[PDB]
Write a protein that binds this ligand. Structure first.
Ligand SMILES: *[C@@H]1O[C@H](CO)[C@@H](O[C@@H]2O[C@H](CO)[C@@H](O[C@@H]3O[C@H](CO[C@H]4O[C@H](CO)[C@@H](O)[C@H](O)[C@@H]4O)[C@@H](O)[C@H](O[C@H]4O[C@H](CO)[C@@H](O)[C@H](O)[C@@H]4O)[C@@H]3O)[C@H](O)[C@H]2NC(C)=O)[C@H](O)[C@H]1NC(C)=O
Ligand SMILES: *[C@@H]1O[C@H](CO)[C@@H](O[C@@H]2O[C@H](CO)[C@@H](O[C@@H]3O[C@H](CO[C@H]4O[C@H](CO)[C@@H](O)[C@H](O)[C@@H]4O)[C@@H](O)[C@H](O[C@H]4O[C@H](CO)[C@@H](O)[C@H](O)[C@@H]4O)[C@@H]3O)[C@H](O)[C@H]2NC(C)=O)[C@H](O)[C@H]1NC(C)=O
Ligand SMILES: *[C@@H]1O[C@H](CO)[C@@H](O[C@@H]2O[C@H](CO)[C@@H](O[C@@H]3O[C@H](CO)[C@@H](O)[C@H](O)[C@@H]3O)[C@H](O)[C@H]2NC(C)=O)[C@H](O)[C@H]1NC(C)=O
Ligand SMILES: *[C@@H]1O[C@H](CO)[C@@H](O[C@@H]2O[C@H](CO)[C@@H](O[C@@H]3O[C@H](CO)[C@@H](O)[C@H](O)[C@@H]3O)[C@H](O)[C@H]2NC(C)=O)[C@H](O)[C@H]1NC(C)=O
Ligand SMILES: CC(=O)N[C@@H]1[C@@H](O)[C@H](O[C@@H]2O[C@H](CO)[C@@H](O)[C@H](O)[C@H]2NC(C)=O)[C@@H](CO)O[C@H]1O
Ligand SMILES: CC(=O)N[C@@H]1[C@@H](O)[C@H](O[C@@H]2O[C@H](CO)[C@@H](O)[C@H](O)[C@H]2NC(C)=O)[C@@H](CO)O[C@H]1O
Ligand SMILES: CC(=O)N[C@@H]1[C@@H](O)[C@H](O[C@@H]2O[C@H](CO)[C@@H](O)[C@H](O)[C@H]2NC(C)=O)[C@@H](CO)O[C@H]1O
Ligand SMILES: CC(=O)N[C@@H]1[C@@H](O)[C@H](O[C@@H]2O[C@H](CO)[C@@H](O)[C@H](O)[C@H]2NC(C)=O)[C@@H](CO)O[C@H]1O
Ligand SMILES: *[C@@H]1O[C@H](CO)[C@@H](O[C@@H]2O[C@H](CO)[C@@H](O)[C@H](O)[C@H]2NC(C)=O)[C@H](O)[C@H]1NC(C)=O
Ligand SMILES: *[C@@H]1O[C@H](CO)[C@@H](O[C@@H]2O[C@H](CO)[C@@H](O)[C@H](O)[C@H]2NC(C)=O)[C@H](O)[C@H]1NC(C)=O
Ligand SMILES: *[C@@H]1O[C@H](CO)[C@@H](O[C@@H]2O[C@H](CO)[C@@H](O)[C@H](O)[C@H]2NC(C)=O)[C@H](O)[C@H]1NC(C)=O
Ligand SMILES: *[C@@H]1O[C@H](CO)[C@@H](O[C@@H]2O[C@H](CO)[C@@H](O)[C@H](O)[C@H]2NC(C)=O)[C@H](O)[C@H]1NC(C)=O
Ligand SMILES: CC(=O)N[C@@H]1[C@@H](O)[C@H](O)[C@@H](CO)O[C@H]1O
Ligand SMILES: CC(=O)N[C@@H]1[C@@H](O)[C@H](O)[C@@H](CO)O[C@H]1O
Ligand SMILES: CC(=O)N[C@@H]1[C@@H](O)[C@H](O)[C@@H](CO)O[C@H]1O
Ligand SMILES: CC(=O)N[C@@H]1[C@@H](O)[C@H](O)[C@@H](CO)O[C@H]1O
Ligand SMILES: CC(=O)N[C@@H]1[C@@H](O)[C@H](O)[C@@H](CO)O[C@H]1O
Ligand SMILES: *[C@@H]1O[C@H](CO)[C@@H](O)[C@H](O)[C@H]1NC(C)=O
Ligand SMILES: *[C@@H]1O[C@H](CO)[C@@H](O)[C@H](O)[C@H]1NC(C)=O
Ligand SMILES: *[C@@H]1O[C@H](CO)[C@@H](O)[C@H](O)[C@H]1NC(C)=O
Ligand SMILES: *[C@@H]1O[C@H](CO)[C@@H](O)[C@H](O)[C@H]1NC(C)=O
Ligand SMILES: *[C@@H]1O[C@H](CO)[C@@H](O)[C@H](O)[C@H]1NC(C)=O
Ligand SMILES: *[C@@H]1O[C@H](CO)[C@@H](O)[C@H](O)[C@H]1NC(C)=O
Ligand SMILES: *[C@@H]1O[C@H](CO)[C@@H](O)[C@H](O)[C@H]1NC(C)=O
Ligand SMILES: *[C@@H]1O[C@H](CO)[C@@H](O)[C@H](O)[C@H]1NC(C)=O
Ligand SMILES: *[C@@H]1O[C@H](CO)[C@@H](O)[C@H](O)[C@H]1NC(C)=O
Lengths: 128, 430, 122, 122, 430, 52
């Protein structure tokens, strides 16, 4: 027990295999009298744009509506040659994000194409 | 094996705009965002992070907002540029010199009428032109002078800063943190503690105290071009006064346009001054030395000398109390050599009414007279010191940017951008 | 009509949900008020969409969940609820439980996604 | 390559749908104007997303419905439409039926959700 | 048999706000977005579109925004309404009157004091009232006059206009496009090329050249109520000067309030002027005539005559260079008849300091004196001509709207909005 | 009933009499926050115009 809730960032220092259980905690907190209030309107708008860019990508990749989604894109090894027994158990998400930061755009490009192929194939089947 | 995750607990350092918040007229009506009556503080288990108080954008924002608010507060107020005339001037009424008794021909509600008016002035705001003698207000050759509205208070009511959605603030719990580098124990908050937007020069008059030991922080120490900020682990009691029962009168200078003038003084004319507990002060300097020696040598002699020359804002200790601006001679506080192996100090203070509040050119504020007698009580929580730069290390008090009075509270906080989207390999495939 | 279903019973009203959903978001001084209003409408819209996402009801006006009704919230018969009450009355009827029901929905969806990953990993 | 498909026929052009979609979200004078621009771009994005939600095509760039083409909207052969026309020409060709098709997509989705609820209750 | 598609490559003509960007003081900063050093352009294969430079709202924004920034830049500057005084005036000493030597009773830093001030003025800014003689500044019966801050540059630094998200700019690659109708070769950009916001009347001095041939464009050509814009395919060099070594002095007229006055002239007093390559100009007109004849007849005689009467702002060529506002006679450039089958032209110029910059009433800008000697070299890139309306077709140079100076760069660009959602019949069903 | 917009209302300034607003549909209406409490005002709406 231990009343484990952890909190908004929660166990940011925990490993990935422990940390990816609080994904919803963070998601629920991302949206949260005269003049010069434009500073806050600017802040509100930018928060909205950040939210939408993330949601659009989940949409494009076919992972919309999920906190965790499997894809059919292979891990190409050069991105990280660590074992899953090392990645999920002895690393935090922050360490991981740094570990593979240089491949962010590679993975994202591959994800977009995979989804493009999947939708194309579904239409061919529905047209059958 | 790619799996995409959203709600990932990661962040990047980022510069964003924080907003103010307030717990239930300057500052006082700045309701900002109402604060949380019982704010949550989340300890981050296993998490460390690096901080740098000398590069903290939060300090820059306090400067940006504090300065802006004071300028905004004068927007609707009566201008005193109509007073930029020659004054005839003499002494007041005293035996045996700070005050002056000056008179001039002022406008009235009608453009066709003039009136003879007079008021008391402080020497520091008046300059002789005819090198009775003829004088002008000292700032009328270069700047606009605006009267602060008499109904508006500038009391430094504490306000909180809070991150916007998508951002959070990391806070140090490290009692020994020296302002930079890894901070082994942190937590996350949405809002900082309330901080009083106090302005001062040589002494830090109302901040937080160090938890255990006097903390000495500097961007460098070795580099003598940098300031040293000293945070006491106990307050020093200081009592300041402007021991003159003054009166005020309003003058109608135009249509709804009023000027507030010093009337006369009831009773004796006495110098403004501050009383610092002597015993406490000596003890705090000794504590400061014990800690300063960590950077200079265990048996290195440390000397406290007075300030260097320049404007009162850098040679004296200044503050706003009761609406008056005090310039105290702190040399009485720094007269000691510390060599390895009840009473009070009275500091005279000068009084000014035309203030270049942010040390800018062209925007002068006039502090309307305050009636009655002023008494100020504060907790000195720290000092701004510089190295006077081989067996003796001499320090002097001095002024600095207003930013240095804020980083003194902000060193424990950092703001980061939350970045919830990311990927990792797993054993699953669609 | 946008609120035409407002006096309808729940069993009658929950057919017009699209009518209401499709109308939810729809030079000088004061232009700031106009901008503020637009921003706020967006924020309201997004909070609802986020929760539907979180609960696994994204893209639907009606979604069944796998969470049971726990009775204490309301002990009325479903036929009483759907045929003799309007949504406005109902909203008041179970107002105080909103956070309980939502907490259960959120927990359930997380368990479901966890189980989906375990199966896709098998 | 955002509009690279602009002169392509529909059957060639509908391959770059992702390319365009991913590029849609991208003081006084020069102060307020940029904030206004961001807000309006957001509203445009959201209206399209809400409709895809309403029609059951959320999360997709290509989705099939169960609505028939009614012929009268366009009597062109599908081989003429997809191979000898561009999307711009096409959009103009049937622009006056936009609201008809959209209304049908909406009604169909409502019927589908109603039927699914009845089945999940069975 | 219906499929809904999103990301569909279609658009509709639309009007939105474009933002400035620049190649990273001067008015040109003011938070423009650093632009893309390697901008992309998408050629659109098999895409054509209809363009109309006369209905181009990108031009409308350029106009609107330039004016707004111009005005914003004068807001913090010292007003010269205190100079609406009676002046005693004579001529500036020379041997035998373009310049006036005038004097007046001016205010000082103190409201109750006066000083004698004298300065040099162009006669064009001064009007005789007492039909020394008495004069007043020529704008005191109509407008407030504001001194431009001497530290702010109005140099026409090129900026790029960029579309907001949801929008794109379509552009022509048709080197023969006449500013209207179908454009056979279209490509698209997020941002336009950099355009210099050059302000002029009769001649265009710093724009783009035609890619191949002199291009003549008009809303109609045949409609005598419309302008004809001529884009050269080659530059013409023009060298302008203010050949007078001037000094400047500042007058303290109030509390930080300064007025910049012409002091005196060092050396000779000479008229301002511009030098236009003569051979180049004649060759240039020959090319213009060959192209004009396309709409008037191959053997039609074309005559270039000088301008009509009226204010200098509409009868002369004008520009802002070196901070001075020059008005040039230009008749030497339009004095010839072209009939089918090294040297220079010197044009005298006049200079004014009080400028009704946007042809509005009540807002006048005062150009402070420029010290030293001014030398400016420009590229004549095009002309604004009108038909003087039977075998001879006469044209005259003239002014026009400011918008005409910019549509000349923006004629190749159009703004459309993207509409990614749409449907088509397919053979699939859920 | 539900509306998105109100009827047109004249932003008229007056004191003792209201001279260009709406008329009551059937009968003169008298409205007050309280009536009994004399600190409250009574607003009287006519069902007929009176010309001035
Ligand atoms: C460090 O922190 C300390 C502690 O908070 C600050 O010291 C306080 O500063 C405030 C502001 O200067 C002082 O408050 C002032 O007290 C005056 C006297 O109050 C007594 O007498 C009046 C007489 O009518 C009674 O009403 C009152 O209840 C007390 O009995 C007030 O006169 C001051 O002004 C008030 O009245 C005027 C009337 O027009 C209003 O316009 C004002 O807005 C206001 O209402 C004011 O209240 C407070 O007493 C100080 N505390 C101590 C212990 O001295 C330090 O200033 C701070 N240091 C720094 C650098 O910020
Ligand atoms: C059409 O386009 C042309 C070409 O772009 C413009 O012509 C140029 O305009 C700029 C702006 O006026 C001219 O630059 C000016 O030069 C003056 C003298 O500089 C000398 O010293 C520098 C030292 O490095 C040399 O590089 C330079 O060649 C000269 O030798 C400066 O004094 C001007 O302003 C600067 O000094 C003043 C002094 O008080 C400051 O106040 C200013 O802020 C600034 O510091 C300025 O730099 C440039 O020479 C022009 N070139 C030509 C060929 O004329 C045309 O003006 C434009 N047409 C129109 C009508 O605008
Ligand atoms: C210098 O300060 C004094 C006050 O401290 C200024 O006011 C002057 O005060 C004297 C004494 O109160 C006034 O004289 C008295 O006037 C009354 C009038 O009926 C008379 O009955 C008394 O016998 C006595 O004469 C004096 O008038 C008063 N002056 C004014 C203008 O009010 C003095 O003005 C200050 N001087 C300057 C230059 O500021
Ligand atoms: C007309 O222009 C002249 C300058 O071109 C303005 O300034 C005047 O210049 C003359 C010559 O420098 C000054 O004369 C001086 O007289 C004294 C007398 O002893 C002599 O010692 C000096 O060597 C010099 O000769 C003259 O005073 C000066 N005027 C002023 C007011 O300074 C003149 O003012 C201009 N007139 C107007 C109406 O603007
Ligand atoms: C499975 C996979 O994609 N592996 C990647 C490697 O293919 C890639 O190196 C390849 O090197 C070739 C050398 O000429 C390139 O031509 C080839 O394009 C490149 N492949 C790709 C996909 O870029 C290495 C490079 O770091 O990364 C692997 O992940
Ligand atoms: C710095 C200073 O002098 N502050 C003043 C206090 O000294 C002063 O004296 C206080 O009187 C109380 C009466 O019993 C004592 O208990 C208290 O210890 C004493 N304070 C100190 C620091 O010695 C108070 C008036 O009561 O006014 C302060 O401004
Ligand atoms: C795709 C489509 O059909 N759009 C409609 C337009 O075609 C229609 O234009 C009108 O079509 C008539 C058909 O004979 C023409 O007679 C009529 O002149 C023409 N109107 C115009 C302005 O060109 C318009 C207007 O009815 O509605 C569109 O939805
Ligand atoms: C392309 C276009 O529409 N051009 C317009 C000209 O056609 C129009 O021509 C004028 O038509 C009148 C019809 O009775 C004639 O009387 C008149 O002489 C004729 N003028 C010219 C210059 O052709 C002109 C002027 O109305 O405007 C053009 O936009
Ligand atoms: C921080 O690190 C410590 C040490 O690795 C973690 O402690 C282990 O936690 C697991 C459960 O996650 C237990 O089964 C182990 O017995 C713990 N080991 C020790 C020595 O404490 C800790 O959980 C991590 N995260 C925190 C504490 O937030
Ligand atoms: C400061 O001056 C004021 C007057 O400006 C004094 O106020 C006096 O208060 C007593 C209290 O009963 C009254 O009877 C007097 O009439 C007041 N004086 C006047 C002129 O009205 C105040 O007491 C003085 N304060 C100090 C500390 O000396
Ligand atoms: C602070 O007070 C000291 C003490 O009065 C001032 O310095 C004194 O100036 C006199 C003038 O001859 C000397 O005799 C004293 O020896 C000086 N004392 C010291 C400690 O130097 C000092 O100038 C005042 N400083 C400020 C900023 O007002
Ligand atoms: C404007 O001034 C420039 C600079 O002096 C002139 O250009 C020079 O022309 C001479 C003519 O033989 C050449 O030898 C120089 O090399 C040119 N200078 C440069 C830098 O190229 C220009 O011709 C003048 N234009 C006019 C119309 O007089
Ligand atoms: C208060 C004051 O300065 N008054 C003087 C007045 O005594 C003098 O008589 C007049 C000119 O003679 O100028 C006024 O300014
Ligand atoms: C919190 C702290 O002590 N920070 C630094 C420390 O990291 C650094 O190593 C040392 C000199 O190297 O200077 C201290 O201020
Ligand atoms: C500085 C100046 O010119 N002041 C003159 C003054 O000398 C002259 O006596 C008066 C009329 O006589 O007009 C003033 O403007
Ligand atoms: C100061 C000034 O020039 N005022 C002019 C006047 O000279 C001119 O005669 C009149 C119209 O002719 O318009 C006024 O504004
Ligand atoms: C680019 C171009 O040449 N546009 C038009 C052309 O389409 C039109 O037919 C002609 C007059 O008929 O006038 C030209 O300006
Ligand atoms: C004040 O009195 C002193 C005594 O010498 C004198 O020098 C000084 O000028 C007086 N102040 C004024 C304004 O006259
Ligand atoms: C230091 O103490 C001595 C003791 O006589 C005194 O004379 C001197 O003025 C003091 N200096 C300061 C700065 O107070
Ligand atoms: C000084 O700190 C103590 C700590 O409790 C506090 O009670 C006291 O009021 C403080 N004094 C001032 C002036 O803030
Ligand atoms: C109102 O109640 C009557 C009673 O039969 C019912 O027929 C009618 O449809 C109801 N209106 C609504 C909006 O349900
Ligand atoms: C343009 O037309 C030619 C004609 O054959 C065709 O081959 C080419 O693919 C077309 N381009 C596009 C973008 O469709
Ligand atoms: C300019 O036009 C006039 C008109 O008669 C003519 O006399 C004069 O010679 C022309 N200028 C030149 C340089 O030919
Ligand atoms: C103007 O004359 C001054 C006299 O010192 C000289 O220094 C300056 O360079 C001259 N300016 C020009 C452009 O000749
Ligand atoms: C004229 O245009 C050419 C084009 O390359 C440029 O190099 C030249 O400097 C321009 N001259 C002027 C005076 O702007
Ligand atoms: C106002 O004047 C018109 C003019 O015909 C008249 O009919 C009407 O009755 C008058 N109203 C009053 C209240 O006298």
């Amino acid at each position: 027990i231990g009343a484990v809730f952890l909190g908004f960032l929660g166990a940011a220092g925990s490993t990935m295999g422990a940390a990816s259980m609080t994904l919803t905690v963070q998601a629920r907190n991302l949206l949260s009298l005269t003049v010069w209030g434009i500073k806050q309107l600017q802040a509100r708008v930018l928060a909205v744009e950040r939210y939408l860019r993330d949601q659009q990508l989940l949409g494009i990749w076919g992972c919309s509506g999920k906190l965790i989604c499997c894809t059919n894109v292979p891990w190409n090894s050069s991105w990280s040659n660590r074992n899953l027994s090392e990645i999920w158990d002895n690393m935090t998400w922050l360490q991981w994000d740094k570990e593979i930061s240089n491949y962010t755009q590679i993975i994202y490009g591959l994800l977009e194409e995979s989804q493009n192929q999947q939708e194309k194939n579904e239409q061919d089947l529905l047209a059958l | 094996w790619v799996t995409v995750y959203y709600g990932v607990p990661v962040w990047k350092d980022a510069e964003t705009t924080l907003f103010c918040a307030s717990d239930a007229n300057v500052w006082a009506t700045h309701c900002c965002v109402p604060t949380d009556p019982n704010p949550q503080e989340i300890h981050l288990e296993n998490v460390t992070e690096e901080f740098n108080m000398w590069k903290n954008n939060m300090v820059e924002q306090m400067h940006t907002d504090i300065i802006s608010l004071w300028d905004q507060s004068l927007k609707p107020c009566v201008k005193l540029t109509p007073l930029c005339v020659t004054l005839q001037c003499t002494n007041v009424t005293n035996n045996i010199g700070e005050l002056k008794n000056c008179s001039f021909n002022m406008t009235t509600e009608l453009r066709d009428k003039k009136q003879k008016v007079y008021s008391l002035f402080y020497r520091l705001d008046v300059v002789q032109i005819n090198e009775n003698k003829e004088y002008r207000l000292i700032n009328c050759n270069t700047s606009a002078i605006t009267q602060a509205c008499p109904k508006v208070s500038f009391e430094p009511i504490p306000i909180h800063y809070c991150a916007p959605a998508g951002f959070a603030i990391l806070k140090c719990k490290d009692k020994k943190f020296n302002g930079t580098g890894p901070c082994p124990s942190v937590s996350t908050v949405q809002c900082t503690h309330g901080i009083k937007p106090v302005v001062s020069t040589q002494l830090l008059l109302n901040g937080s105290l160090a938890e255990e030991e006097v903390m000495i922080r500097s961007e460098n120490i070795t580099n003598n071009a940098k300031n040293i900020l000293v945070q006491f682990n106990t307050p020093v009691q200081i009592n300041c006064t402007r021991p003159n029962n003054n009166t005020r009168k309003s003058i109608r200078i135009g249509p709804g346009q009023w000027f507030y003038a010093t009337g006369d003084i009831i009773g004796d004319i006495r110098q403004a001054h501050c009383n610092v507990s002597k015993a406490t002060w000596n003890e705090t300097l000794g504590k400061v030395v014990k800690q300063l020696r960590k950077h200079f040598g265990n048996n290195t002699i440390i000397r406290f000398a007075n300030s260097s020359g320049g404007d009162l804002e850098v040679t004296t200790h200044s503050f706003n109390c009761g609406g008056e601006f005090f310039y105290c001679n702190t040399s009485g506080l720094f007269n000691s050599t510390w060599i390895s192996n009840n009473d009070s100090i009275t500091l005279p203070c000068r009084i000014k009414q035309i203030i270049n509040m942010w040390q800018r050119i062209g925007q002068a504020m006039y502090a309307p007279p305050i009636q009655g007698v002023i008494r100020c009580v504060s907790n000195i929580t720290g000092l701004i010191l510089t190295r006077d730069g081989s067996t003796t290390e001499t320090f002097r008090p001095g002024g600095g940017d207003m930013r240095d009075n804020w980083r003194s509270e902000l060193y424990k906080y950092k703001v980061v951008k939350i970045e919830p989207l990311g990927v990792a390999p797993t054993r699953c495939k669609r």
